[PDB]
Design an enzyme around this catalytic site. Structure first.
Site, short mmCIF file in Angstrom:
data_model
loop_
_atom_site.label_atom_id
_atom_site.label_comp_id
_atom_site.label_asym_id
_atom_site.label_seq_id
_atom_site.Cartn_x
_atom_site.Cartn_y
_atom_site.Cartn_z
N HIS A 1 0.82 -1.22 0.00
CA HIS A 1 0.00 0.00 0.00
C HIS A 1 0.86 1.28 0.00
O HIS A 1 0.29 2.36 -0.17
CB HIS A 1 -1.10 0.02 1.08
CG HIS A 1 -0.63 0.22 2.48
ND1 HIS A 1 -0.61 -0.82 3.39
CD2 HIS A 1 -0.29 1.36 3.12
CE1 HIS A 1 -0.22 -0.28 4.54
NE2 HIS A 1 -0.01 1.03 4.42
N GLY B 1 2.27 5.77 9.97
CA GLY B 1 3.70 5.76 9.69
C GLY B 1 4.40 4.50 10.18
O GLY B 1 5.53 4.23 9.77
N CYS C 1 3.44 1.42 9.50
CA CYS C 1 3.35 0.33 8.53
C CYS C 1 4.71 -0.15 8.07
O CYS C 1 5.63 0.66 7.90
CB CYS C 1 2.45 0.70 7.36
SG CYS C 1 0.79 1.16 7.88
C1 LIG Z 1 -3.28 4.93 10.78
C2 LIG Z 1 -2.61 3.66 11.24
C3 LIG Z 1 -2.47 3.39 12.60
C4 LIG Z 1 -1.91 2.19 13.00
N1 LIG Z 1 -1.47 1.25 12.15
C5 LIG Z 1 -1.59 1.52 10.84
C6 LIG Z 1 -2.16 2.69 10.34
N2 LIG Z 1 -2.40 2.87 8.95
C7 LIG Z 1 -3.40 2.24 8.30
O1 LIG Z 1 -4.18 1.48 8.85
C8 LIG Z 1 -3.51 2.54 6.82
C9 LIG Z 1 -4.49 1.61 6.12
C10 LIG Z 1 -4.05 0.77 5.11
C11 LIG Z 1 -4.93 -0.11 4.53
CL1 LIG Z 1 -4.41 -1.06 3.17
C12 LIG Z 1 -6.25 -0.20 4.93
C13 LIG Z 1 -6.72 0.65 5.94
C14 LIG Z 1 -8.14 0.61 6.37
C15 LIG Z 1 -8.82 -0.62 6.37
C16 LIG Z 1 -10.17 -0.69 6.67
C17 LIG Z 1 -10.92 0.45 6.99
C18 LIG Z 1 -12.41 0.35 7.17
C19 LIG Z 1 -10.23 1.64 7.03
F1 LIG Z 1 -10.89 2.76 7.37
C20 LIG Z 1 -8.90 1.72 6.71
F2 LIG Z 1 -8.32 2.94 6.69
C21 LIG Z 1 -5.82 1.56 6.51
#
Ligand SMILES: Cc1ccncc1NC(=O)Cc1cc(Cl)cc(-c2ccc(C)c(F)c2F)c1
Ligand SMILES: Cc1ccncc1NC(=O)Cc1cc(Cl)cc(-c2ccc(C)c(F)c2F)c1
Lengths: 304, 304
Positions: B41, B143, B145
């Site tokens: 991603h 950040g 990821c």
């Molecule tokens: C902000 C954060 C905090 C801790 N760890 C990681 C992150 N970053 C992400 O989750 C980025 C991300 C990537 C992907 Cl491929 C799918 C989604 C996502 C999946 C499902 C839903 C419904 C939704 F809203 C989404 F944003 C979200």
């Protein structure tokens, strides 16, 4: 989101761990520049431990009696001295993996990471707090002596603890890197009282702010309190009295969440008086006190 | 003595962390030999995330669009490919700090350490379990990821997790190092149900053995139970059914303490049915399930 008991990355410290053997005893040492630091009780035999005369025991030792090994290679000892409860072994080679470092004496209530080691080899890393009574509740076995506690700010490791002993009560005692014990302890096999401990109020409040930031808000209520009223409750429940200095340290978290410190105190007061009623906060069924306000801000902001 | 949620020393993994930037997105990569692994991603923009066509998005990218930086130095990308949900960026230089490593797919209920990173820089390390429903309860911010999960056996790092996303429920989802998600998740911003989770019974029993080894024995009782009777209680309290394989994995701890596994099951049954009555076990007011029997033996034996 999510909140975990996070330790600092241990790499900079792993590069400093060595094995120190004197006679029959093997423990860990910390190699910074051309000096290896370790607990002075490495020079004791089991019989010496009841009342050791460290000055006399050290006189019977020469540089060649201190076997220092960094992984697979042997270090050459060219000097030895005792500073308080630590031995400083001067070696002929500066540790090439010496990070930028400082020696600091941490205050009770502050937290640090421990790199538990055996035979100069790291086994694991965990976060803990220096209790108000100057003990730590660690995870250490025989051979872990000389394992160190530290914090990291950018590229600088501030060493704050060296492990010396486990008291019959199962708690841990150690020194700063100048060999001064935290608390009233002595490096001798004799009865030693750790003082009455208390819960670190400012850390519990910081952790309640961390809970709010991470979505656990069930404990927020419609109440407020004063520093005086909160401190009456803190007294009853063996919590440290909250001061204006603590309120100011919680300033950044109060600003982030919009929850006044005294309003969070009223939530903590209700939790102390009523308990959790079978509920949890950040995966815990008790009030956590081993996260400082700085730890919460660091973990919630992603400081590297 | 003492029992802590201990993570592996992170040094071997810190040496593998890099920053990967594609267009506007920056996340973490893992540099092993001449390959950098990262979540695919990284090639998405915020608009692409609702339903990304990763094949089409990757076609618009060339080797020179993947900016890989290891600390201060830039790496030269000579190839790129997608394997499941990971991108593999071939670089012209083998990581000199590449430890001995393996890629493994861990089973639900197993534990591992996470080195949380931001911009290719390590921020902290913590231990966690792969939940029975294939989520992890971590501590990750935007950040993070590309941060990885791992275990270490002697000098070999077995990488088992790469962080991809946080679901609206606040739980974390990711892949093995071949890019296969753990659980039913997809790397798309769409509603995603994590299955019903359960408590890892064998780990709770291991932790009760760790409590006995460390002197917390108040929960031991005069009772015994059978696998069938215990499993009726496990069903009622949403605990994983205990199998003979689990009993055998607890064999070493049963031998060490002299407490038959089914006798420990009767203690766990009483704790499930009566609660803790305001008491604690190893500093916890709830039944801990993120320690495996191997973790307990390792921590209680000082494996380095
Ligand atoms: C902000 C954060 C905090 C801790 N760890 C990681 C992150 N970053 C992400 O989750 C980025 C991300 C990537 C992907 Cl491929 C799918 C989604 C996502 C999946 C499902 C839903 C419904 C939704 F809203 C989404 F944003 C979200
Ligand atoms: C076994 C272990 C497990 C975890 N961490 C460290 C260790 N090692 C030690 O504590 C060794 C040690 C050294 C010194 Cl200088 C004093 C004592 C000691 C102090 C007071 C008492 C009463 C007593 F019995 C003692 F043995 C004990």
């Amino acid at each position: 989101s999510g909140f975990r008991k996070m330790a600092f990355p241990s790499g900079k410290v792993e590069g400093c761990m060595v094995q120190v053997t004197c006679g029959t005893t093997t423990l860990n040492g910390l190699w910074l520049d051309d000096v290896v630091y370790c607990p002075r009780h490495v020079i004791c035999t089991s019989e010496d431990m009841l009342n050791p005369n460290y000055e006399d025991l050290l006189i019977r030792k020469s540089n060649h009696n201190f076997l220092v090994q960094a992984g697979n290679v042997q270090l050459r000892v060219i000097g030895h001295s005792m500073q308080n409860c630590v031995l400083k072994l001067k070696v002929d080679t500066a540790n090439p993996k010496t990070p930028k470092y400082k020696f600091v004496r941490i205050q009770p209530g502050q937290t640090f990471s421990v790199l538990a080691c055996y035979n100069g080899s790291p086994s694991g890393v965990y976060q803990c707090a220096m209790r108000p009574n100057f003990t730590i509740k660690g995870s250490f076995l025989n051979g872990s002596c000389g394992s160190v506690g530290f914090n990291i700010d950018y590229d600088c490791v501030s060493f704050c603890y060296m492990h010396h002993m486990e008291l019959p009560t199962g708690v841990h005692a150690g020194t700063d890197l100048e060999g001064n014990f935290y608390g009233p302890f002595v490096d001798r096999q004799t009865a030693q009282a750790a003082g009455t401990d208390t819960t670190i109020t400012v850390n519990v409040l910081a952790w309640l702010y961390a809970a709010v930031i991470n979505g656990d808000r069930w404990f927020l209520n419609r109440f407020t309190t004063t520093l005086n009223d909160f401190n009456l409750v803190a007294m009853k429940y063996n919590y440290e009295p909250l001061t204006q200095d603590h309120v100011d340290i919680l300033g950044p978290l109060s600003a982030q969440t919009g929850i006044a410190v005294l309003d969070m105190c009223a939530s903590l007061k209700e939790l102390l008086q009523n308990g959790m009623n079978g509920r949890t906060i950040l995966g815990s069924a008790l009030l956590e006190d081993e996260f400082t306000p700085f730890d919460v801000v660091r973990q919630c902001s992603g400081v590297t």
